Structure formats: C-alpha cells, structure tokens
Swiss-Prot record, chain A:
Compartments, as annotated in UniProt: Secreted; Cytoplasm
Protein name (Swiss-Prot/TrEMBL): Transthyretin
Gene name linked to the record: TTR
Residues shown, of full length: 30 to 145 of 147
Disease with which this protein is associated in UniProt: Amyloidosis, hereditary systemic 1: A form of hereditary systemic amyloidosis, a disorder characterized by amyloid deposition in multiple tissues resulting in a wide clinical spectrum. AMYLD1 is an autosomal dominant form due to transthyretin amyloid deposition. Protein fibrils can form in different tissues leading to amyloid polyneuropathies, amyloidotic cardiomyopathy, carpal tunnel syndrome, systemic senile amyloidosis. The disease includes leptomeningeal amyloidosis that is characterized by primary involvement of the central nervous system. Hyperthyroxinemia, dystransthyretinemic: A condition characterized by elevation of total and free thyroxine in healthy, euthyroid persons without detectable binding protein abnormalities.
Subunit structure and binding partners: Homotetramer. Dimer of dimers. In the homotetramer, subunits assemble around a central channel that can accommodate two ligand molecules. Interacts with RBP4.
GO CC aspect terms: azurophil granule lumen; extracellular exosome; extracellular region; extracellular space; protein-containing complex
Outcome of mutating residue 88 to G: In AMYLD1; amyloid polyneuropathy
Effect of residue 115 to S: In AMYLD1; uncertain significance
Known outcome of mutating residue 9 to E: In AMYLD1; amyloid polyneuropathy
Length: 116, 115
C-alpha cells in the first residue's frame, strides 16, 4: 500500500471517520485527472487507494473533504477542503503517508515517506 | 486590508521572505481565476492584495510557492506548494488573515477573521 491518508479531529480528540478523500494526478494538458478516492475508516485511516503499478510518477493532489466533516458534526468550518500537492515516485517507488490534523479554522498536514 | 497572508519558516524560526503567493477566485465554470498575487516582505507578510470592492463572497484558493522557497535555501522539500481553499462569507468579521507555518515535510495553516 503505497499511499495512505490518516485524519484526526482536534475538537473531539478522535479519529475523523467517514471523511471523503479524492486523489488527482496532473495530466499532460495541466488539468487534474481523477486518480483514486475513498472514505476514512473508524480508525481515521484510508488504505487501499492505489497499487504500486497504478501509482506512477507524477504530481498528485490529495483533497480531503473537511467542510462536509464539520457540517456533519454541527460545527461551522472555514476551509472548503484540505489540499496536499506533491511530486511522487520521481526516483522510484516510495510509500507515502499523508496525515491531516483538523480544526474548524486550521489544519496541519505532514508527510511520512519511506523506501520499500 | 480585507485579506492578508503571513508565512513563517519553522526550520529557522523566521519570517519566510520573498515567497510567491497567488490567490484565485472560483469562477462559474469551476475554473480558478487569478485574483491577486505578490511576494512576501521581509516580515513574511503580504499586504495590499485586494480592496473591499473587489473581495466579494465566493470560494478562494491561496497557493504559496513553498517548493521554490526551500530549494533556494538548500533544503529538500516535499510539497509543490501549500494550498488554502476557503469560502469568504459576508458578516461582521471582515478582515481575513491566512497564516502558513512551513516545514520541509509539513505545514500548518490557520485563519483569523476579525471585525
Ligand atoms: Ca524520474
């Protein structure tokens, strides 16, 4: 599993469950092509987005649907989504974990990158 | 000043100076229309991006060119840029400050909206 996303809720001190995540890959015409998507589990994690084969080198955008998460909890948020944009696999396959720590008017995002 | 952007460097504990910042407004066709841009000052701040008359309700994207900032310092970065996408909503709080706290493999962003 070469791309994983983990999301935490900093208001309630819990994993952020059922958060929609969309991944896009920058296409040759500079548009964003849908690549993969899913929802976080009860642990706040989203596994199984892609495979080593499918996950070619390129520029990827991970969009985390934070606004819907806050709306479901009955909280007024500021951001539409959290966005993480990065070049992946430029020197061969790597494994990427994108974390997002969410508050209504702020978020933090970190990447952990490991070599298989 | 309806909109200000402040950028900080969490490796050296300093303002992030001469960082390119681009703001876009979402158009009816869902494309991103250039709205304002500039480079951060010696204080890490970018003022004078827009006026009250120009800054209408809608969805805005702030793209901060972090990759160019780190690479020039000789430090290898992860992100292409930092992105902040938000809805501007008319109410009492009318001055928006978007702050970005930068590290090579992470960033934090907060918004302060005051009256
Ligand atoms: Ca390459």
């Amino acid at each position: 599993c070469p791309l994983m996303v983990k999301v935490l809720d900093d208001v309630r001190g819990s994993p952020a469950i059922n958060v929609a995540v969309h991944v896009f890959r920058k296409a040759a015409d500079d548009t964003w092509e849908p690549f993969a998507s899913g929802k976080t589990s009860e642990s706040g994690e989203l596994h199984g987005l892609t495979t080593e084969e499918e996950f070619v080198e390129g520029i990827y955008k991970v969009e985390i649907d934070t606004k819907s998460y806050w709306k479901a909890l009955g909280i007024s948020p500021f951001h539409e989504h959290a966005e993480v944009v990065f070049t992946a696999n430029d020197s061969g396959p790597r494994r990427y974990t994108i974390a997002a720590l969410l508050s209504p008017y702020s978020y933090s995002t970190t990447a952990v990158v490991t070599n298989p």
